[PDB]
RNA sequence: AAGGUAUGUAUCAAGCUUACAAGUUAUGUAUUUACUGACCU
RNA sequence: CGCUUCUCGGCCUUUUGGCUAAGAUCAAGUGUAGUAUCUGUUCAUCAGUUUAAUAUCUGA
């Protein structure tokens, strides 16, 4: 799995306005959701409305 | 997500500036501060020259920044050696 | 160089050995120490090109890559017709920085 | 380190003259080394215009030498009582007077 | 569902609307602050 | 002439209004070679030293 620099010692010590300082990091939260995409997006739990992405 | 209780920010923000622009704004801000303090003190000997430095005009002394001028208000009392020029201004008390 | 005032040049008779510059200093002139208008190759003496010191940088003493040159402003002042411009001593910079 | 030379003391005097008393981040925003904690610490420790930073009297010394015997440490409890009140000006008095009562 | 990809102006048609009423130089120093050299991994 | 009141002008706090949990948080720099500038600071008559000239030493 991931190994890469979540500690990130002195990250490259940047300025970090507000929401990039205290907000939640979306990217592990969405790679977990990508990872179980067959069972979080399974076609037959309710079998009514489905919406296909464009392109 | 708390869309209510997340630390907010506005779109199109451009972000917080780097150290060079921040402390340049600090130097301009401090210039405005010292200018308004000597304006309140109504000091008639503060001069700023052709390159952004400060001069005690009776003193004829140069100063790099603001606190180099307004800490030159205590030493070398020509500030009261204008009593000689006041005696030339008026031959009595 | 012009920046470090304590660096001394070799200044002996310039032989046939063409000077070389390291990869960190390519494009630098040797005397006026700039980047533009290179006009004249560097000829270094035989003591400052002997054996272990062949193809070595004129300034840094690192491994050379490209040939060294003088400016046009060193050329027309004839600062190429003095001795060999091989900077000899390493003094008070890149020594204490090594100890730091 | 907190060295506090003169060219920041006089800028702090100007800033407290402009901005106010309970507003310290806004005047630590123009000092390039200092935080607001250090600004509070100096302007109440050294630069306050109520601080009578000289003139050791005789009434306050006979006061403190049996006020710093009531509560033997604690030079921040007996600093407002003496009113010399820099809380180390008191400690300067007490160590100087116990050198001069020893010699 | 809202809570995020701003809103506020200035010209250019269908949407909708009635099909109507109508002739004082100065020193020595403790000492910051500024400044220089395309100085430097 | 003097006294009190009224009205017009010469005018010396006017910052964007109020309230919440001061609404809430934040704010890293090196090393090298050199200069400039503040603050602190202090400034009796020969003889030779020295200096463009001046200003240390020694002399009574
Ligand atoms: Mg918002
Ligand atoms: Zn050149
Ligand atoms: Zn050589
Ligand atoms: Zn090189």
Please count the beta strands of chain B (DSSP E, at least 2 residues each): 3
Helix-strand makeup class of chain C: mainly beta
Instruction: Tell me about the largest β-sheet of chain C.
Output: 2 strands, antiparallel
User: Structural class per helix/strand content of chain B?
Assistant: alpha+beta
Helix content of chain C: under 10%
For the largest beta sheet of chain B, what order do the strands appear in spatially?
A: 1-2-3
If you had to describe this structure to a student in words, what would you say it looks like?
The structure is cut from a larger assembly and holds chains A (55 residues), B (93 residues), C (100 residues) and D (103 residues). With 55 residues, chain A is mostly helical. Chain A has three helices and no strands. The longest helix of chain A is centred in the middle third of the chain and has 10 residues, at 26-35. The radius of gyration of chain A is 18 Å and the shape is elongated. By secondary structure, chain C is mainly β. Chain C has one domain. Chain D has two domains: 1-51, no CATH class; 52-103, no CATH class. Chain D is 48% helix and 0% strand. The longest helix of chain D has 13 residues, at 6-18. Chain D is mainly alpha-helical. Chain D is built from six helices and no strands. Classes of the chains: A mainly alpha (55), B alpha+beta (93), C mainly beta (100), D mainly alpha (103). Chains in contact: A-B, B-D. The interface between B and D is medium-sized, with 14 and 13 residues. Bound molecules: magnesium ion (MG) and zinc ion (3 copies). One zinc ion binds at residues 21-22, 24-25, 57, 59-60, 62 of chain C. Chain B binds two RNA strands through residues 1-4, 7, 9-12, 16, 19, 22, 53, 61-65, 67-69, 71-72, 74-76, 78, 81. Chain A: Residues 11-24 are annotated as: Important for branch point selection.
Condensed summary:
Chain D: Residues 24-47, 75-97 bind DNA. Chain D: This is Cell division cycle 5-like protein. Chain A has 55 residues and is mainly α.
List the helices and strands and how they pair.
The structure is cut from a larger assembly and holds chains A (55 residues), B (93 residues), C (100 residues) and D (103 residues).
Chain A: H1 19-22, H2 26-35, H3 37-40
Chain B: H1 19-41, E1 46-48, E2 54-56, E3 61-63, H2 66-69, H3 82-89
Antiparallel strand pairs in B: 1-2, 2-3
Chain C: E1 17-18, E2 20-22, E3 38-41, E4 43-44, E5 64-67, E6 69-71, H1 72-75
Antiparallel strand pairs in C: 1-4, 2-5, 3-6
The complex binds magnesium ion (MG) and zinc ion (3 copies).
One zinc ion is lined by residues 21-22, 24-25, 57, 59-60, 62 of chain C.
The structure holds 2 RNA strands.
